[PDB]
Every structure is written in structure tokens, then in C-alpha cells.
Symmetry: C3
Subunit: 21 residues, 3 copies
């Protein structure tokens, strides 16, 4: 599968997450 990269950002706090397809 492919894993794209995003940051999940909220109230001045970001965390990297994968989005798997």
C-alpha cells in the first residue's frame, strides 16, 4: 500500500500522521 504524510494540526500543536492507501 502507499502511506502519505500529513500533519494533524490543532490549537498550535501538530503531530505527524500517516494516511495509508
Amino acid at each position: 500500500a502507499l502511506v502519505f504524510f500529513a500533519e494533524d494540526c490543532g490549537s498550535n500543536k501538530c503531530a505527524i500522521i500517516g494516511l495509508m492507501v
Copy 2:
């Protein structure tokens, strides 16, 4: 929001950008 990352490339050069959703 989610922030994805892309290299935005012109003829000679590339910059990293966030694409925010």
C-alpha cells in the same frame, strides 16, 4: 486541519509548501 507537504517546482527551482485542509 490536515497539512500535506509538496515540493512546488518551477523551471529551475523547488520549494517545500504546506497544503492545508
Copy 3:
């Protein structure tokens, strides 16, 4: 063009690939 990035995962190997738009 924009180049996005993904980890392409097979049975064992994982490599980062670009994806161009």
C-alpha cells in the same frame, strides 16, 4: 508542478517515492 511524497510498501521493502502533478 507539485511533487507529493509517499512511502511505497510491498511485502518487505519500503521506499519513498515522488508523485508529480
